[PDB]
Every structure is written in structure tokens, then in C-alpha cells.
């Protein structure tokens, strides 16, 4: 009766920035989705390819939990075939994505009157991300034809930006913690069921 | 890379820090206006300075992306806003002098005062002293004191400054490729778009004149009616064929004849509709006032106020020691933060104000998806017209009855209908010739068409000819009576109120025809008309992203200022004036003066 480490991911005190989104491999445990309680206001639970309605009786080889924080406007982008600064440059899900995307408003946790600059997102990237790619590069974005010399300048911008969360922000700019449960099926033992 | 793609990315990095600093300012600016402390005053000016600093820097960086190579309007209109230099085109000599003059005129206006000839120790500041005199005194001489005293003890002090202000503003405009400072102000309405949605700066001149030439019939019969109902009081002081004395018009300048209503109400017996008593009798509070306004917009398909609106706004005077200048404000701070700063009292006028101010929020919320520099009214008059039609709909007996304020008693009569429209006309119709004439004067002043040794002489010639208003005291060139009005002294364009007034009735009429409204336009409540709300959102959500000529068309179906909706709003009063002026002189001889 080995309980899966979901309390680690959802209930963590600090979430990763979306650009440097954190993945937590989950294996050899009973997956208790049943207690993935409705955490916070504006709760969002979206599943693709498989049904969350108590279809725990399925087993999966490995189950990856990808967590990060984005603003409410960008939760729609954590879905197959979506475009935007997050889906293009920060976190991309495949077209054939089989999993679930969970999202709750975390304004009470991740905002600050002075602005929480801890959460970042990639604003610039010469290419969009292949599915589940992570880009933590901090190389200056060379918008221009002149080389940037690794320092911010004209036509040379830092690729990341801060969300600068303030509790007063509108719902569209408030922080939303997101956890993406990718379910993997290989010709493999399939060690994660959970009754 | 291309000078457009480079522009986009630059605007991306600008739109990030701007939206950051603009928020920081708006909050720090909100925290002062709701806490008024010298400490929060520093933070407000500091965040305002970091914001101004960034904008000034980015303006310079932006000019390096030539607009001639931009095709995307979302980039062009964004770049155009940032690229405009302003006073930063003058030498630091001229700029430091221009600021010195501007801050001087603003200080001379506020700190200035006029003293009684009877009581030379009663040096009364305009706000609130001389304003109480102009707005309430029925005494000819007490009104004559303040009017002449203000235009002398303040208006003369501004005369040398305004002469310099016109010169230093011209040099700023000409160096920014504008004919004069007036053509610079008219550039707000300039749209260089395709599809016949273009608009020239000079087209505003013709348009404002041509539309005024149709307000003239309304104004004359309002004038002859005001002149007659005025002539009852001040009897020997107002000629039956002459112009109106300027000090007898309500406001210190005659901007709003709103306060002539006690002396001009058609059927004074029939009481005004005041649901203020009905609100107290139902234990209404400020939150209820705004919840009803929220329900109003929701009825017409607009979103409710955000949660951050209810838990951040100041809908009541805070109290304690927390001073807050009680004046309605609608805050688009940014990052989805929408707030209203209002010392709401449970009255009808604050109820109507709450809808008006919440209209601003609906406009601010609608275009929040627009790029930051485009998050604004389609032009300077759009944002105010959207607010005004919110009080127009909410003030009708229909809306008051459906919300339980005015009892289910189907009130109204052919007399109270005339009373309200007369009250409206004093405010809305009365200001238009005042606004056109004042701004026409500045345009000719800036154009150079009026020599300085004839400024006042040409001003009062225009006042008599166009506004039908004459000075009680002759004024030589030591006066600068226009400068005795706030916007003139404080360097604010004024054709906004003219244009906004025309717009709001174009707005209201278009929405009311959408609303299947049967009957007079002034009785129209757009409530529950989700078809009208959609055409509104189609324009509201545009912001400044598209020309006002086109944005106006997404509501009213015309590319320009049409005054006929305004006339149709007052046709009931127009016909009733033509009869109550049948035996009266409609017009004015410009040579009559109360000083012989
Ligand atoms: C209205 O404004 C005043 C001052 O502008 C606010 O007073 C500040 O209140 C906060 C929280 O109550 C205090 O932390 C703050 O004191 C800080 O600053 C001083 C130096 O100024 C510092 O030495 C302290 O250690 C502390 O960090 C108060 N500052 C002042 C100057 O009074 C007040 O909260 C505001 N209230 C509202 C309702 O807006
Ligand atoms: C987080 O903690 C609460 C309180 O104990 C619990 O109900 C919830 O299941 C926890 N979340 C996860 C993912 O375990
Ligand atoms: C620009 O608009 C004006 C009216 O605003 C119109 O008269 C003029 O024809 C337009 N420009 C051109 C080149 O036609
Ligand atoms: C907000 O407006 C919607 C739209 O009609 C309405 O259904 C909803 O009830 C409103 N909000 C609340 C809290 O009632
Ligand atoms: C609008 O709808 C409400 C109920 O939704 C109704 O009571 C009211 O009479 C309608 N009309 C107006 C003008 O409010
Ligand atoms: Zn307003």
C-alpha cells in the first residue's frame, strides 16, 4: 500500500517557474487521485485521452507530474494544440497528449503587495518548443542583426520576464499553479495503478 | 530581422515594463488618493517618475523604428503613441521655461483670489468661494464682483504667461511638424487609416463648425428662453434683444448653465424626480448602488465587475484620518485591476454617477486585451461619452421604476418631460457654444489669426457673436479672461467636451434603435438590450486600436460626428421653445452691453 507522492507536488510551498517547469517522475505507488481535493478558487481540471471520472482502475507505466505557475490568462494554453508565450516558449503539450491539466488560483500564496518577482516565464525564443521540452537558457535574445555580446542592449532583450504577481491583480494576471499529469503507456510492467 | 519585427519585439519588452511601472504608479497613485499622506505622496510621485522616466527613454528608443516601414496598425498606433516627442523637442531652455509658465499658470489659477470692492478684506479663492457666488447668488452685483475680480486679480496675472505659453507651445508643435499648437491638439482626432476611415486634423475644424451651425437653432431658442426667464430677475440688466451678461450664467465663465435652472425651470411647480428619498427609505448603501449598476451592465451583456473591483475599490469615504478628495474616479490601474474611487452617498446623483463611473470600468475592461498603449478611449471624447450614456439610461423613469426606486406609479407628464429636458439643455446644450467658441479662439490664437493686442477684443467679439454672451465690464488687452478658466490656464484641450457631447447622443440613439425603443430618445433605457451591449463591446473592446471614425461606426454606423442624434434628443424641448419664444426675439444684437 505505497501511496503516490502527490502531496509533494500539489501541496508544495513553492512552485517552479513555467519556463523552468518541474517534472516529478512517479512510479511504484498506488495513485490516489481520489484525494486530489478541489484545492483553491477558480479550480480547473482538464483531461485528455483518458477520463478522470474514477477511472483509477487503469494502470500506467510511469506518471509524470509537471508543475509550474502561470497567470490565469495562460491556463488555456496548457492544452494540446494551443499557442501562446507559454505553449510556444515555456511549456508545450503534444497534439496527442494523454493526461490531465490541473489548475487553481494561488493568489493568496504567490502574490505580494510589492510584487512577487520570483515567478518567471520565457518571453522570447527563436523557436517554439517541442512537446514537453524545457528551456532554461538565459542567453540574450538577439532580435536584431547585430550580435548582443551576452548583455541586454538595443534589439537585445533578456529572454525571460517576471510575472510580478500582486494580490490586487485581476483574475487574468493572478498566479495559477498548474500540475500536468502525463500518463505513459509502454510495453512495460505498468507499475502505477491505484485502486 | 525587419524594422517591423524589431518594432514588435521592442513593443513587447516595452509593454512588459510599462505595464509593470504603470501599475506601480497607478497603485502608488491610488494609495495617495485614498490615504492622502505626505508619505504616500512621495511614493506616488516616485512611481510616477520611474514611469515617466521609462516612457521618456522608450520614446527615444521607439523613434528608431521608422513608422514608414510599419504595416501592422497594432504596431503602428502603438509606435505612433510612443514615438510622439512633445515638449522634449524644445531646447532645455524652452522646456524649463514652458514648465515654469505652465506650473505658474496652474498655481496662479488655484492660489489666486479676488477681493470685494465693498470688503477688500474678503479675498475669496475661486474654489470654493467665488464658485459658490457664481453658482448660487441671485445678486447681480455680487456675481458681477466675482466675475470681474477673478478675470482681473487672476486673469490679468496670466496674460503675460499665456502669451509666452502660446509662443512656447507653438515652437513645440512646429518642431513636431504641426501647423501650430492648435493643430497639435487636433491631432488626437487625426486618423491616417484606409477605407475612408481616415480623418484630417483640419477636418475637425469644419466638422465642429458645421455641427455647431445645427446646434445654433437649439441654442438660440435656449438663449431666448434663458434670456427671458433671466429677464424676470435682474430685470433692467438684460436686454430683450441684447446678449446675456457673462456673470449671470451659473459657472464663473458660463460654461454650464446648469445653475440657471431655478431661474429658468419651465413649470417650476412640477417637482423633479428624486429617488434619493426612495433610496434612504429602503436602507440602500453604496455597495447596493454599485451592485445595481453592475446588474445594469450585466443586463446588456457586459461583464460584471471583477472580484478585485469589489475588494479594492473605494466606494465610500474611508473615514478615520484617511483623507480622500471626494470626487468620482474610475481606475484602470492595469493587470486586470479595475477600481472606482468614489465617496458614494445614497443619492440619485451618486447613483447615476455610479453607473457613469462603472461605464468607464466597462470600457477599461473591454479593451484590456488590447496592447497597453491602445488601452484607452478611441479618441479623447469616446471614454466620456460611454460614461454619460450610462447615466442617461439609468436616469429615465423606466429604469428607476424597474429597479424599485421610483414607485410602480407611472409618473411623468408633458411638463416634467419639458422640465428635465430644459435641465439637460442648460448643462448639455448650453456648454456647446461655450466650448466651441473657447476652443475656436485658442485655435485662431495658436494659428496666429489673432494678434496679441486683440486677444480679448476678438475673444468677446466671438463671445457675443457665437455664444450670445457679453462681458459686463469692457476688457482691454491687460485681461486674459479665457485663462481664467481652468483648462485654458492648465493647458488642457477643450474640444473634447464638444465632441464627447455629440458622441454620447450618437451612442445613445444608435443603441436605442438597436434596443427597439419606441418613443422619444430621452426616455430610452438600454437595459436588457444585449444587442445594444454587443455593438457597444464591439467598440469598447477596440480601445484606441482602430480609428475613432471606425470605432464610432461600430456603434452608430457613421464615420463622423453627427449632431442630429443630439437634436433628436432635444426636439421635444426644441418645439416647445419655438412656441414659448414665438413672440420673443430669437437671436442677439452684439452691440448691446450693460455698461452703455
Ligand atoms: C496610510 O499611509 C500611512 C503612511 O503613508 C501608512 O502607514 C504605514 O503603515 C504600515 C502598516 O501599517 C507600516 O508598516 C508603516 O511603517 C513602516 O515605515 C516606517 C518608515 O516610514 C518604518 O520605519 C517601519 O519599520 C515600517 O516598516 C507605516 N508608515 C508610516 C509612515 O506611517 C498607512 O498604513 C496607510 N493606511 C492606509 C489605510 O492606506
Ligand atoms: C494537501 O493537504 C490537504 C490537507 O491535509 C489534503 O486534504 C490534500 O489531499 C493535500 N494534497 C495532496 C495533493 O495530497
Ligand atoms: C481624409 O478624410 C477627409 C475627411 O475626414 C476626406 O475629405 C478626405 O478625402 C480623406 N483623404 C483623401 C486623400 O481623400
Ligand atoms: C455575473 O453576471 C452573470 C451574467 O448574467 C450572472 O449570471 C451572475 O449571477 C453574476 N454574478 C453573480 C455573483 O451573481
Ligand atoms: C429588464 O429585466 C428585468 C428582469 O430581468 C425586468 O424586471 C425589467 O422590467 C426589464 N426591463 C428594464 C427596463 O429593466
Ligand atoms: Zn466620467
Numbering used by the authors:
A (entry chain B): 333 to 527
B (entry chain A): 19 to 614
Share the article's original sentences.
The Omicron variant of SARS-CoV-2 carries multiple unusual mutations, particularly in the receptor-binding domain (RBD) of the spike (S) protein. There are 15 amino acid (AA) substitutions in the receptor binding domain (RBD) of the S protein, nine of which are located at the binding interface of the SARS-CoV-2 RBD and human ACE2 (hACE2) receptor, namely K417N, G446S, S477N, E484A, Q493R, G496S, Q498R, N501Y, and Y505H. Receptor binding is the key step for SARS-CoV-2 infection. Omicron BA.1 was found to display a broader host range than the prototype, whereas the Delta variant showed no alteration.
Furthermore, cvACE2 also efficiently mediated Omicron BA.1 pseudovirus entry, but weakly mediated the prototype SARS-CoV-2 pseudovirus entry. For cvACE2, seven substitutions were observed: Q24 (human)/L24 (palm-civet), D30/E30, K31/T31, H34/Y34, E37/Q37, D38/E38 and M82/T82. Q24 of hACE2 formed an H-bond with N487 of the RBD, whereas L24 of cvACE2 did not. No significant change was observed between D30 of cvACE2 and E30 of cvACE2, whereas T31 of cvACE2 formed an H-bond with R493. H34 of hACE2 formed an H-bond with Y453 of the RBD, whereas Y34 of cvACE2 formed two H-bonds with S494 of the RBD. In contrast, the hydrophilic T82 of cvACE2 may sabotage the hydrophobic patch comprising F28, L79, and Y83 of cvACE2 and F486 of the RBD, whereas M82 of hACE2 may participate in the hydrophobic patch. D38/E38 displayed a different H-bond network, where D38 of hACE2 interacts with Y449 and R498, whereas E38 of cvACE2 formed H-bonds with Y449, S494, R498, and Y501 of the RBD. Similarly, R498 also promoted RBD binding to cvACE2, where the longer side chain of cvACE2 E38 formed an additional H-bond with R498. However, when the prototype RBD or omicron RBD binds to cvACE2, the small side chain of T31 could neither bind to E484 nor A484 in the RBD. E484A, Q493R, and N501Y could facilitate cvACE2 binding.
